[PDB]
Design an enzyme around this catalytic site. Structure first.
Site, PDB file in Angstrom:
ATOM      1  N   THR A  50      -3.277  16.329   1.685  1.00 56.14           N
ATOM      2  CA  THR A  50      -4.716  16.431   1.468  1.00 56.14           C
ATOM      3  C   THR A  50      -5.388  15.069   1.603  1.00 56.14           C
ATOM      4  N   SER A  85      -6.925  46.288  -1.011  1.00 59.16           N
ATOM      5  CA  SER A  85      -7.919  46.276   0.057  1.00 59.16           C
ATOM      6  C   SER A  85      -7.907  44.953   0.810  1.00 59.16           C
ATOM      7  N   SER A  86      -7.811  43.836   0.084  1.00 57.37           N
ATOM      8  CA  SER A  86      -7.752  42.534   0.739  1.00 57.37           C
ATOM      9  C   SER A  86      -6.498  42.408   1.593  1.00 57.37           C
ATOM     10  N   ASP A  96     -13.027  42.860  20.434  1.00 56.16           N
ATOM     11  CA  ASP A  96     -13.060  43.528  19.141  1.00 56.16           C
ATOM     12  C   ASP A  96     -11.724  43.311  18.445  1.00 56.16           C
ATOM     13  N   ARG A 132     -10.840  25.166 -24.964  1.00 55.63           N
ATOM     14  CA  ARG A 132     -11.735  26.026 -24.206  1.00 55.63           C
ATOM     15  C   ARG A 132     -11.734  27.436 -24.787  1.00 55.63           C
ATOM     16  N   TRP A 136      -9.906  36.197 -17.726  1.00 52.98           N
ATOM     17  CA  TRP A 136      -9.519  36.303 -16.324  1.00 52.98           C
ATOM     18  C   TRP A 136      -8.018  36.541 -16.191  1.00 52.98           C
ATOM     19  N   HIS A 171      -1.381  30.308  -8.471  1.00 54.10           N
ATOM     20  CA  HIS A 171      -1.369  28.964  -7.897  1.00 54.10           C
ATOM     21  C   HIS A 171      -1.749  28.950  -6.419  1.00 54.10           C
ATOM     22  N   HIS A 175     -17.531  37.259 -16.015  1.00 58.28           N
ATOM     23  CA  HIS A 175     -17.941  36.172 -15.132  1.00 58.28           C
ATOM     24  C   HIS A 175     -16.772  35.708 -14.275  1.00 58.28           C
ATOM     25  N   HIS A 218       3.488  24.897 -13.216  1.00 54.33           N
ATOM     26  CA  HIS A 218       2.596  23.910 -13.813  1.00 54.33           C
ATOM     27  C   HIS A 218       1.611  24.545 -14.785  1.00 54.33           C
ATOM     28  N   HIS A 219       1.417  25.860 -14.707  1.00 57.30           N
ATOM     29  CA  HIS A 219       0.592  26.591 -15.656  1.00 57.30           C
ATOM     30  C   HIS A 219       1.365  27.002 -16.901  1.00 57.30           C
ATOM     31  N   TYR A 279      -5.658  27.891  -3.154  1.00 58.66           N
ATOM     32  CA  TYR A 279      -5.476  27.280  -1.837  1.00 58.66           C
ATOM     33  C   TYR A 279      -5.894  28.224  -0.716  1.00 58.66           C
ATOM     34  N   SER A 332     -13.976  21.124   9.003  1.00 61.16           N
ATOM     35  CA  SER A 332     -13.433  20.553  10.230  1.00 61.16           C
ATOM     36  C   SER A 332     -14.159  21.055  11.471  1.00 61.16           C
ATOM     37  N   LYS A 390      -5.685  14.396   5.217  1.00 62.45           N
ATOM     38  CA  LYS A 390      -6.811  15.141   5.779  1.00 62.45           C
ATOM     39  C   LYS A 390      -8.137  14.447   5.487  1.00 62.45           C
ATOM     40  N   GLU A 403      -3.438  31.224  -4.782  1.00 63.69           N
ATOM     41  CA  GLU A 403      -4.694  31.928  -4.531  1.00 63.69           C
ATOM     42  C   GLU A 403      -5.838  30.955  -4.289  1.00 63.69           C
TER      43      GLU A 403
HETATM   44  C1  HEA Z   1      -9.823  25.687  -6.307  1.00 64.68           C
HETATM   45  C2  HEA Z   1      -8.746  25.161  -5.736  1.00 64.68           C
HETATM   46  C3  HEA Z   1      -7.808  24.238  -6.400  1.00 64.68           C
HETATM   47  C4  HEA Z   1      -7.275  23.135  -5.858  1.00 64.68           C
HETATM   48  C5  HEA Z   1      -7.483  22.567  -4.484  1.00 64.68           C
HETATM   49  C6  HEA Z   1      -6.431  22.563  -6.871  1.00 64.68           C
HETATM   50  C7  HEA Z   1      -5.729  21.442  -6.691  1.00 64.68           C
HETATM   51  C8  HEA Z   1      -4.736  21.023  -7.516  1.00 64.68           C
HETATM   52  N1  HEA Z   1      -4.488  21.517  -8.787  1.00 64.68           N
HETATM   53 FE1  HEA Z   1      -5.420  22.944  -9.762  1.00 64.68          FE
HETATM   54  N2  HEA Z   1      -6.216  24.496 -10.557  1.00 64.68           N
HETATM   55  C9  HEA Z   1      -7.074  25.409 -10.002  1.00 64.68           C
HETATM   56  C10 HEA Z   1      -7.544  25.308  -8.701  1.00 64.68           C
HETATM   57  C11 HEA Z   1      -7.267  24.329  -7.766  1.00 64.68           C
HETATM   58  N3  HEA Z   1      -6.430  23.305  -8.040  1.00 64.68           N
HETATM   59  C12 HEA Z   1      -7.431  26.482 -10.974  1.00 64.68           C
HETATM   60  C13 HEA Z   1      -8.368  27.707 -10.821  1.00 64.68           C
HETATM   61  C14 HEA Z   1      -6.738  26.164 -12.105  1.00 64.68           C
HETATM   62  C15 HEA Z   1      -6.700  26.892 -13.455  1.00 64.68           C
HETATM   63  C16 HEA Z   1      -5.886  28.126 -13.454  1.00 64.68           C
HETATM   64  C17 HEA Z   1      -6.319  29.069 -14.510  1.00 64.68           C
HETATM   65  O1  HEA Z   1      -6.101  28.726 -15.691  1.00 64.68           O
HETATM   66  O2  HEA Z   1      -6.710  30.202 -14.148  1.00 64.68           O
HETATM   67  C18 HEA Z   1      -6.001  24.968 -11.835  1.00 64.68           C
HETATM   68  C19 HEA Z   1      -5.190  24.377 -12.773  1.00 64.68           C
HETATM   69  C20 HEA Z   1      -4.260  23.424 -12.523  1.00 64.68           C
HETATM   70  C21 HEA Z   1      -3.225  23.010 -13.452  1.00 64.68           C
HETATM   71  C22 HEA Z   1      -3.043  23.629 -14.859  1.00 64.68           C
HETATM   72  C23 HEA Z   1      -3.323  22.720 -16.066  1.00 64.68           C
HETATM   73  C24 HEA Z   1      -3.324  23.478 -17.390  1.00 64.68           C
HETATM   74  O3  HEA Z   1      -4.102  24.437 -17.549  1.00 64.68           O
HETATM   75  O4  HEA Z   1      -2.440  23.200 -18.217  1.00 64.68           O
HETATM   76  C25 HEA Z   1      -2.508  22.025 -12.805  1.00 64.68           C
HETATM   77  C26 HEA Z   1      -1.435  21.359 -13.332  1.00 64.68           C
HETATM   78  O5  HEA Z   1      -0.605  20.870 -12.610  1.00 64.68           O
HETATM   79  C27 HEA Z   1      -3.135  21.857 -11.483  1.00 64.68           C
HETATM   80  C28 HEA Z   1      -2.772  20.963 -10.458  1.00 64.68           C
HETATM   81  C29 HEA Z   1      -3.397  20.803  -9.209  1.00 64.68           C
HETATM   82  C30 HEA Z   1      -2.962  19.837  -8.217  1.00 64.68           C
HETATM   83  C31 HEA Z   1      -1.827  18.885  -8.332  1.00 64.68           C
HETATM   84  C32 HEA Z   1      -3.791  19.955  -7.140  1.00 64.68           C
HETATM   85  C33 HEA Z   1      -3.710  19.152  -5.863  1.00 64.68           C
HETATM   86  O6  HEA Z   1      -3.933  20.019  -4.740  1.00 64.68           O
HETATM   87  C34 HEA Z   1      -4.775  18.076  -5.720  1.00 64.68           C
HETATM   88  C35 HEA Z   1      -4.475  17.106  -4.596  1.00 64.68           C
HETATM   89  C36 HEA Z   1      -5.724  16.380  -4.170  1.00 64.68           C
HETATM   90  C37 HEA Z   1      -5.898  15.065  -4.364  1.00 64.68           C
HETATM   91  C38 HEA Z   1      -5.034  14.370  -5.371  1.00 64.68           C
HETATM   92  C39 HEA Z   1      -7.012  14.275  -3.782  1.00 64.68           C
HETATM   93  C40 HEA Z   1      -6.765  13.758  -2.354  1.00 64.68           C
HETATM   94  C41 HEA Z   1      -5.567  12.851  -2.239  1.00 64.68           C
HETATM   95  C42 HEA Z   1      -5.627  11.530  -1.982  1.00 64.68           C
HETATM   96  C43 HEA Z   1      -6.863  10.633  -1.949  1.00 64.68           C
HETATM   97  C44 HEA Z   1      -4.333  10.830  -1.832  1.00 64.68           C
HETATM   98  C45 HEA Z   1      -4.166   9.645  -2.745  1.00 64.68           C
HETATM   99  C46 HEA Z   1      -4.103  10.016  -4.219  1.00 64.68           C
HETATM  100  C47 HEA Z   1      -3.354   9.382  -5.159  1.00 64.68           C
HETATM  101  C48 HEA Z   1      -2.143   8.561  -4.827  1.00 64.68           C
HETATM  102  C49 HEA Z   1      -3.865   9.215  -6.552  1.00 64.68           C
HETATM  103  N4  HEA Z   1      -4.211  22.723 -11.324  1.00 64.68           N
HETATM  104  C1  HEA Z   2     -14.989  31.396  -8.126  1.00 63.25           C
HETATM  105  C2  HEA Z   2     -14.889  30.372  -8.968  1.00 63.25           C
HETATM  106  C3  HEA Z   2     -15.878  30.057 -10.016  1.00 63.25           C
HETATM  107  C4  HEA Z   2     -17.170  29.720  -9.858  1.00 63.25           C
HETATM  108  C5  HEA Z   2     -17.940  29.571  -8.577  1.00 63.25           C
HETATM  109  C6  HEA Z   2     -17.694  29.517 -11.192  1.00 63.25           C
HETATM  110  C7  HEA Z   2     -18.965  29.178 -11.471  1.00 63.25           C
HETATM  111  C8  HEA Z   2     -19.376  28.695 -12.675  1.00 63.25           C
HETATM  112  N1  HEA Z   2     -18.660  28.770 -13.856  1.00 63.25           N
HETATM  113 FE1  HEA Z   2     -16.900  29.573 -14.177  1.00 63.25          FE
HETATM  114  N2  HEA Z   2     -15.095  30.177 -14.389  1.00 63.25           N
HETATM  115  C9  HEA Z   2     -14.163  30.462 -13.427  1.00 63.25           C
HETATM  116  C10 HEA Z   2     -14.426  30.354 -12.071  1.00 63.25           C
HETATM  117  C11 HEA Z   2     -15.626  30.052 -11.460  1.00 63.25           C
HETATM  118  N3  HEA Z   2     -16.728  29.725 -12.163  1.00 63.25           N
HETATM  119  C12 HEA Z   2     -12.874  30.899 -14.032  1.00 63.25           C
HETATM  120  C13 HEA Z   2     -11.545  31.326 -13.361  1.00 63.25           C
HETATM  121  C14 HEA Z   2     -13.090  30.840 -15.378  1.00 63.25           C
HETATM  122  C15 HEA Z   2     -12.127  31.173 -16.525  1.00 63.25           C
HETATM  123  C16 HEA Z   2     -12.253  32.572 -16.989  1.00 63.25           C
HETATM  124  C17 HEA Z   2     -11.470  32.831 -18.219  1.00 63.25           C
HETATM  125  O1  HEA Z   2     -11.408  31.893 -19.039  1.00 63.25           O
HETATM  126  O2  HEA Z   2     -11.170  34.020 -18.469  1.00 63.25           O
HETATM  127  C18 HEA Z   2     -14.437  30.398 -15.579  1.00 63.25           C
HETATM  128  C19 HEA Z   2     -14.985  30.227 -16.830  1.00 63.25           C
HETATM  129  C20 HEA Z   2     -16.111  29.522 -17.108  1.00 63.25           C
HETATM  130  C21 HEA Z   2     -16.513  29.056 -18.426  1.00 63.25           C
HETATM  131  C22 HEA Z   2     -15.653  29.318 -19.692  1.00 63.25           C
HETATM  132  C23 HEA Z   2     -16.346  29.501 -21.053  1.00 63.25           C
HETATM  133  C24 HEA Z   2     -15.672  28.709 -22.170  1.00 63.25           C
HETATM  134  O3  HEA Z   2     -14.508  28.299 -22.011  1.00 63.25           O
HETATM  135  O4  HEA Z   2     -16.392  28.294 -23.094  1.00 63.25           O
HETATM  136  C25 HEA Z   2     -17.713  28.391 -18.238  1.00 63.25           C
HETATM  137  C26 HEA Z   2     -18.473  27.781 -19.195  1.00 63.25           C
HETATM  138  O5  HEA Z   2     -18.955  26.703 -18.973  1.00 63.25           O
HETATM  139  C27 HEA Z   2     -18.013  28.473 -16.800  1.00 63.25           C
HETATM  140  C28 HEA Z   2     -19.133  27.958 -16.124  1.00 63.25           C
HETATM  141  C29 HEA Z   2     -19.458  28.133 -14.769  1.00 63.25           C
HETATM  142  C30 HEA Z   2     -20.697  27.662 -14.178  1.00 63.25           C
HETATM  143  C31 HEA Z   2     -21.776  26.939 -14.905  1.00 63.25           C
HETATM  144  C32 HEA Z   2     -20.662  27.998 -12.847  1.00 63.25           C
HETATM  145  C33 HEA Z   2     -21.709  27.768 -11.778  1.00 63.25           C
HETATM  146  O6  HEA Z   2     -23.003  28.094 -12.314  1.00 63.25           O
HETATM  147  C34 HEA Z   2     -21.865  26.363 -11.221  1.00 63.25           C
HETATM  148  C35 HEA Z   2     -22.965  26.296 -10.174  1.00 63.25           C
HETATM  149  C36 HEA Z   2     -22.895  27.473  -9.230  1.00 63.25           C
HETATM  150  C37 HEA Z   2     -23.922  28.312  -9.010  1.00 63.25           C
HETATM  151  C38 HEA Z   2     -25.095  28.259  -9.939  1.00 63.25           C
HETATM  152  C39 HEA Z   2     -23.919  29.418  -8.016  1.00 63.25           C
HETATM  153  C40 HEA Z   2     -24.495  29.072  -6.629  1.00 63.25           C
HETATM  154  C41 HEA Z   2     -24.627  30.245  -5.689  1.00 63.25           C
HETATM  155  C42 HEA Z   2     -25.428  30.270  -4.602  1.00 63.25           C
HETATM  156  C43 HEA Z   2     -26.485  29.242  -4.204  1.00 63.25           C
HETATM  157  C44 HEA Z   2     -25.534  31.567  -3.899  1.00 63.25           C
HETATM  158  C45 HEA Z   2     -24.873  31.611  -2.546  1.00 63.25           C
HETATM  159  C46 HEA Z   2     -24.743  33.022  -1.986  1.00 63.25           C
HETATM  160  C47 HEA Z   2     -24.333  33.359  -0.733  1.00 63.25           C
HETATM  161  C48 HEA Z   2     -25.029  32.813   0.468  1.00 63.25           C
HETATM  162  C49 HEA Z   2     -23.486  34.566  -0.458  1.00 63.25           C
HETATM  163  N4  HEA Z   2     -17.022  29.167 -16.118  1.00 63.25           N
END
Ligand code: HEA
Ligand code: HEA
Ligand code: CDL
Ligand code: PEF
Ligand code: PEF
Ligand code: CA
Ligand code: MG
Lengths: 114, 77, 100, 45, 537, 145
Positions: free
Chosen positions: E321, E162-163, E97, E444, E132, E246, E67, E295-296, E250, E261, E324, E248
């Site tokens: 952010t 490819s990407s 093109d 988890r 993952w 990290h 998944h 941070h991870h 963004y 926008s 924005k 990816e």
């Molecule tokens: C999908 C995109 C996305 C985005 C945008 C972000 C945004 C951020 N993420 Fe996250 N993050 C993930 C995707 C993302 N992350 C994923 C996939 C993981 C898990 C990785 C994995 O295990 O595979 C992860 C995990 C993850 C961790 C790991 C925790 C753990 O597993 O131990 C941490 C820790 O620092 C973190 C931090 C942040 C921070 C600081 C931001 C910041 O960008 C957020 C900033 C945004 C705001 C805060 C809101 C707007 C701001 C304002 C309104 C200003 C005023 C606010 C204050 C003064 C309060 N992220």
């Molecule tokens: C791309 C990012 C992404 C997205 C979209 C999702 C989608 C979802 N994920 Fe997943 N998930 C991850 C990224 C993502 N996940 C990652 C990185 C992990 C960790 C893997 C690891 O641990 O190894 C994870 C793991 C993970 C777990 C971990 C299991 C465990 O720890 O017990 C669970 C369980 O709740 C979960 C739930 C869901 C659910 C309910 C949705 C969704 O169902 C929520 C609602 C969304 C939809 C139902 C789909 C809607 C789609 C459309 C309407 C079609 C549009 C099509 C086009 C027009 C092209 N995800």
């Protein structure tokens, strides 16, 4: 009583009307709206009434376009809106003893097997 | 070739007496609703049969509390 | 920044003093109703004269409709209509609420 | 060649009666693949 | 004989328009499989104990890993990053093109074999089990014996290359094929974002290529790259992986920023507030999102000074952010709003979900705070409530906003709005209880859990079911739009102003748009931009 | 354009406009354009109504579609109830629950962890504790069969 029952049953059946009956009615109405005018007095009366009640006289093109758009679904909707179970007004003159009461007359306006 | 030569938009269809397909297509929802009503009535009239209670009613949540036996250990001889 | 509050009022009055095209009149009239600046009596009166000159009726009633929409309360609109009634009666202007 | 598109780029012809079953069957099988996937890992068990 | 014409128009064709549609279709067929996988895994944890399965933990690991991998690398990246860019970027830059048509054709077709080989790998006797983020010792031949995870490594490698190959032509196209009089500063925000993602992805992914290859070589060549007894340190693997992971997310979410926008102004009939400030803050985000990677690795056990250095800088990401979001809020007010439009609905719903997800992200950016939430359900809630609320919503909005330009059809507004509401409610009640489940201190990736957690899982399962009906409704609406023959004008999103006559507007006002793509007919010509559009120099 | 246009030509315009052919539309627009040259005082009310409806009307460009919000609300409700019903129906086909999900064992554990001061601050061993604690309640903890 049988005559009134069958008349109201044929009234109420109009909610499931078929395409062929609607087409035949459309053709007959289009023919009849034009076959009536056959004299100067009739044409003058028609023009006067149309101008007095609506405000303008509809050209045959507009009438044809308005009639042609009608389909069977519109007939079904209108019948279910006004022809289905609803209040009615009755008037009888003569030897009307065989006529039943108001409730029995009204009961035939809706069919229970649907 | 055509039933009405002056208007080709008129085709006859298979039938028995008046059981033409369009009438049945109109009728189907009435049959569905009548069958649902009959099923509901049958279910209503047999909601206290012990087999029905022990097979269908009790596994259903929320309502399952009502259709139980509440007698304590003091019970059938 | 650029133009201030009253300067654009005077500029648009000067522009609407001489407009001969419907498109330009509508363009300037659109661009005027975006600065949170409700037109003054001279500006609206000159816009009505311009609409009379370029020979377009519905723009005149659209003026009053837009002013009623833009104004904050009913009192300001009532004052405007009271002070501009003679003009409308002079140019044969019928308001929306009385039109139908 | 100067053709005018007919606003139709569907990758395959579509119409009401027949193609609906094909589209729905493709959707169903691509939805139900995970099923056979989960069944395969628990076949000999 | 149209068969030769059929396959020349589809397979032996290199036009940008004929490829993005296939990108969308491939994304859709990956996303359905991923959604069903997610549904099955969420139905497993409905109640405590083995459920619908014979306690097969390895099967659950395979399900979660599949998944995650397929929905992060086959659903969102290929169907958003390059799908809406290759079709649309030439339109906004002023070119007929892309720079290299052959590489554009090649990049797309590397993905189908990747999907087939990933499915084959998952169909092995064991299957991938590292999740993952696969880890060397678990992936070591000691645990897995067979061609299960090697094919997953290969799929990740080839998809990444490819990407990268699908992003080299885009940068050249939008750096050299610019319109006469179109300064790079005056570029639209969407292409700005897409170029930033392209450069970031190309800069970072090679590192993944090298690291993944050297880690995979441990299984075959018996190298001591990461062996604890061989002198290898897996913390090096974690550093290498999180120098990529990290940024990816963004680079995945920036196209959503651009599409939001773009959606806001046209459906708001108001120019975007502070374009230069927004783009410079986004550039600051792009540069900033590289020096923070550890941070991870907060609870791995690194030094105090390194932890402070890489935890203090985690907070500064929030400021641009927030700027924005404030700019978009300011843009929304004042101008007219058509809240009933589906793209407007998605754009409005994106903001609140993204900001709450950002707040959750700023919750756990501290080493003092992460120790209570590291590798628990709270991080799951954060990253899901950011990913599936931002990228998925942006993709849906982009589809519903540019679909007439792709094909030339109209969808059903009622069904689309119903689908949007159902999906929003389902995804809000799916990731809601998980916040409490992770706040209690429960980890988890566990098919079984202690008994005092059943209620929130039960609350999540119903929403998981609801999401499937949302998917069904989206499928139905897509089919209906494809076979409804509903015509569309040149610029369906252009309306007369408050002082436009009904006869003046129709004859002396048509053919005007804020962007180039709305100037051409909705089904665009094969050879557009015969002459270059020249602006005011 | 000097003679007054007949009233039966500019009455109930909105209903007729869609069906009315193009030629009549151009004729009416040209006639009104020639008419508006004169001072507007001499004009009748219906002429003003027709002119305004032609210019700032609902036809032509600014003719937007209307979406029934009640339909959206009812569709959302129906989808939610269908999801709930389907989940409930496919729920019963699961494996049997663990034997520890019974009221008796839940209360036994509740009286058990109280002895070893497991969370006595405001949890399983509070001073009053009218609340449940380690019982989920409802269907999650049914009575012994
Ligand atoms: C999908 C995109 C996305 C985005 C945008 C972000 C945004 C951020 N993420 Fe996250 N993050 C993930 C995707 C993302 N992350 C994923 C996939 C993981 C898990 C990785 C994995 O295990 O595979 C992860 C995990 C993850 C961790 C790991 C925790 C753990 O597993 O131990 C941490 C820790 O620092 C973190 C931090 C942040 C921070 C600081 C931001 C910041 O960008 C957020 C900033 C945004 C705001 C805060 C809101 C707007 C701001 C304002 C309104 C200003 C005023 C606010 C204050 C003064 C309060 N992220
Ligand atoms: C791309 C990012 C992404 C997205 C979209 C999702 C989608 C979802 N994920 Fe997943 N998930 C991850 C990224 C993502 N996940 C990652 C990185 C992990 C960790 C893997 C690891 O641990 O190894 C994870 C793991 C993970 C777990 C971990 C299991 C465990 O720890 O017990 C669970 C369980 O709740 C979960 C739930 C869901 C659910 C309910 C949705 C969704 O169902 C929520 C609602 C969304 C939809 C139902 C789909 C809607 C789609 C459309 C309407 C079609 C549009 C099509 C086009 C027009 C092209 N995800
Ligand atoms: C099942 C319940 C359906 C009710 C049956 C019904 O409405 O009549 C039959 C009715 C047929 O009438 P219809 O063409 O639908 O139009 C009804 C009119 O209102 C015509 O109605 P009407 O005003 O002319 O009066 C007819 C109606 C009036 O009757 C009454 O008012 C009932 C009086 C009480 C008698 C017993 C009950 O009679 C009935 O309802 C039938 C009563 C049967 C008499 C005794 C039964 C013995 C065994 C059968 O529908 C059915 O046949 C029902 C079954 C359909 C299966 C598919
Ligand atoms: C990710 C890191 C891996 C290394 C990076 C290289 C990737 C493979 C090489 C692809 C070429 C890069 C761009 C060259 C410049 C350019 O553009 O060449 C120009 C052309 C496209 O442009 P055009 O002819 O349309 O220009 C218009 C001219 N006026 O390219 C090509 O036809 C590429 C040739 C096809 C090769 C694709 C197969 C790739 C095999 C990968 C496996 C081998 C590596 C395995 C690694 C473990
Ligand atoms: C964490 C939260 C803390 C909040 C603390 C921030 C406090 C200061 C923010 C207020 C500054 C802006 C006010 C305008 C003052 C003014 O009058 O500006 C002047 C202009 C007047 O128009 P003009 O330029 O054409 O004048 C021309 C002169 N000849 O106004 C505007 O254009 C406003 C247009 C954009 C502002 C929209 C605001 C949208 C929301 C903003 C943030 C909301 C916060 C939500 C959380 C609390
Ligand atoms: Ca379970
Ligand atoms: Mg950890």
């Amino acid at each position: 009583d049988d005559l009134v029952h069958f008349t109201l049953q044929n009234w109420a059946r109009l909610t499931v009307a078929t395409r062929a009956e609607v087409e035949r009615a459309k053709a007959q109405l289009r023919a009849s709206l034009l076959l009536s005018l056959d004299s100067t007095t009739a044409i003058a009366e028609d023009i006067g009434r149309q101008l007095l009640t609506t405000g303008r006289r509809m050209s045959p093109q507009e009438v044809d376009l308005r009639i042609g758009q009608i389909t069977e679904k519109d007939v079904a909707r209108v019948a279910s809106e006004m022809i289905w179970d609803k209040d009615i007004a009755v008037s009888a003159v003569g030897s009307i003893e065989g006529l039943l009461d108001y409730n029995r007359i009204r009961s035939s306006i809706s069919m229970n097997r649907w | 070739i055509s039933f009405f030569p002056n208007k080709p938009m008129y085709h006859v269809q298979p039938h028995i007496s008046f059981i033409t397909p369009e009438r049945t297509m109109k009728t189907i929802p009435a049959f569905s609703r009548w069958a649902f009503a009959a099923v509901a009535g049958v279910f209503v009239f047999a909601m206290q049969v012990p087999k029905v209670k022990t097979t269908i009613l009790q596994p259903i949540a929320f309502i399952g509390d009502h259709f139980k036996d509440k007698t304590p250990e003091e019970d059938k001889w | 920044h650029g133009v201030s509050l009253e300067e654009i009022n005077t500029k648009y009055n000067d522009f609407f003093s001489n407009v001969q095209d419907q498109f330009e009149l509508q363009r300037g009239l659109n661009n005027c109703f975006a600065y949170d600046i409700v037109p003054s009596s001279d500006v609206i009166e000159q816009a009505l004269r311009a609409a009379r000159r370029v020979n377009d009726f519905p723009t005149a009633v659209r003026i009053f409709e837009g002013i009623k929409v833009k104004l904050p309360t009913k009192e300001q609109y009532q004052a405007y209509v009271k002070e501009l009634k003679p003009v409308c009666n002079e140019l044969g202007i019928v308001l929306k609420e009385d039109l139908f | 060649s100067a053709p005018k598109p007919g606003s139709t780029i569907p990758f395959y012809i579509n119409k009401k009666p027949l193609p609906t079953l094909l589209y729905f069957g493709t959707f169903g099988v691509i939805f139900s693949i995970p099923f056979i996937v989960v069944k395969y890992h628990n076949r000999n068990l | 004989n149209s068969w030769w014409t059929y396959v020349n128009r589809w397979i032996f064709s290199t036009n940008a328009k004929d490829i993005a549609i296939l990108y969308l279709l491939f994304g859709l067929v990956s996303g359905i499989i991923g959604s069903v996988f997610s549904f099955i895994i969420r139905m497993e944890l409905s109640a405590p104990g083995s459920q619908f399965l014979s306690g097969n933990g390895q099967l659950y690991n395979v399900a979660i890993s599949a998944h995650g991998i397929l929905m992060i690398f086959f659903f969102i990246i290929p169907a958003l990053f390059g799908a809406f860019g290759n079709y649309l970027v030439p339109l906004m830059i002023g070119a007929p093109d892309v720079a290299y048509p052959r590489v554009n054709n090649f990049t797309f077709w590397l993905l189908p074999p990747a999907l087939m080989l990933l499915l084959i790998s998952a169909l092995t006797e064991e299957g991938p089990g590292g999740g993952w983020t696969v880890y060397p010792p678990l992936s070591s031949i000691t645990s897995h014996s067979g061609p299960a995870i090697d094919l997953a490594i290969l799929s990740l490698q080839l998809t990444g290359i490819s990407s990268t190959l699908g992003s080299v032509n885009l940068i050249a196209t939008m750096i050299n094929m610019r319109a006469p009089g179109l300064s790079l500063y005056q570029m639209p925000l969407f292409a700005w974002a897409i170029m930033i993602t392209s450069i970031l992805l190309l800069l970072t992914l090679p590192v993944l290529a090298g690291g993944l290859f050297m880690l995979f070589s441990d299984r075959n060549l018996n190298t001591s790259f990461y062996a604890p007894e061989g002198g290898g340190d897996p913390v090096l693997y974690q550093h290498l992986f999180w120098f990529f992971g990290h940024p990816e997310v963004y680079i995945l979410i920036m196209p959503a920023f651009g599409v939001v926008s773009h959606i806001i102004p046209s459906l708001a009939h108001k120019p975007i507030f502070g374009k230069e400030g927004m783009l410079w803050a986004m550039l600051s985000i792009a540069l900033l999102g590289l020096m923070v990677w550890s941070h991870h690795l907060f609870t791995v056990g690194l030094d105090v000074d390194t932890r402070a250095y890489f935890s203090a800088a985690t907070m500064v990401i929030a400021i641009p952010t927030g700027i924005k979001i404030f700019s978009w809020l300011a843009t929304l007010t004042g101008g007219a709003i058509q809240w009933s439009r589906v793209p407007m609905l998605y754009a409005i719903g994106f903001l609140i979900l993204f900001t709450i997800g950002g707040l959750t992200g700023v919750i756990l950016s501290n080493s003092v705070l992460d120790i209570a939430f590291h590798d628990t359900y709270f991080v799951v809630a954060h990253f899901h409530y950011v990913l599936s609320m931002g990228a998925l919503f942006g993709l849906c909005g982009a589809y519903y906003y540019w679909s007439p330009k792709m094909f030339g059809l109209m969808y059903n507004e009622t069904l689309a709005s119903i689908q949007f509401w159902i999906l929003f409610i389902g995804v809000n009640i799916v990731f809601g209880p998980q916040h409490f489940l992770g706040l209690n201190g429960m980890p988890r990736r566990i098919p079984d859990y202690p008994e005092a957690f059943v209620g929130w899982n039960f609350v999540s399962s119903i929403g998981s079911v609801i999401s499937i009906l949302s998917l069904f409704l989206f499928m139905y609406v897509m089919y209906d739009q494809f076979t409804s023959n509903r015509v569309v004008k040149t610029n369906p999103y252009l309306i007369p102003s408050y002082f436009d006559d009904n006869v003046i507007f129709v004859n002396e006002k048509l053919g005007v748009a804020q962007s180039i793509e709305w100037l051409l007919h909705s089904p665009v010509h094969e050879h557009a931009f015969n002459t270059l559009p020249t602006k005011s120099i | 354009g000097e003679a007054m246009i007949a009233r039966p030509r500019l009455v109930d315009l909105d209903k007729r406009w869609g069906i009315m052919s193009q030629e009549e539309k151009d004729g009416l627009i040209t006639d009104l354009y020639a008419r508006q040259k004169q001072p507007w005082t001499t004009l009748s009310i219906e002429e003003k109504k027709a002119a305004y409806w032609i210019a700032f009307g609902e036809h032509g460009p600014r003719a937007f579609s209307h979406i029934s919000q009640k339909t959206v609300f009812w569709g959302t409700v129906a989808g939610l109830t269908i999801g709930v019903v389907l989940f409930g129906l496919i729920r019963t086909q699961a494996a049997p629950s663990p034997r520890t999900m019974t009221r008796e064992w839940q209360e036994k554990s509740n009286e058990y962890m109280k002895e070893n001061k497991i969370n006595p601050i405001s949890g399983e061993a509070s001073e009053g504790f009218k609340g449940r604690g380690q019982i989920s309640g409802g269907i999650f903890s049914p009575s012994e069969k």
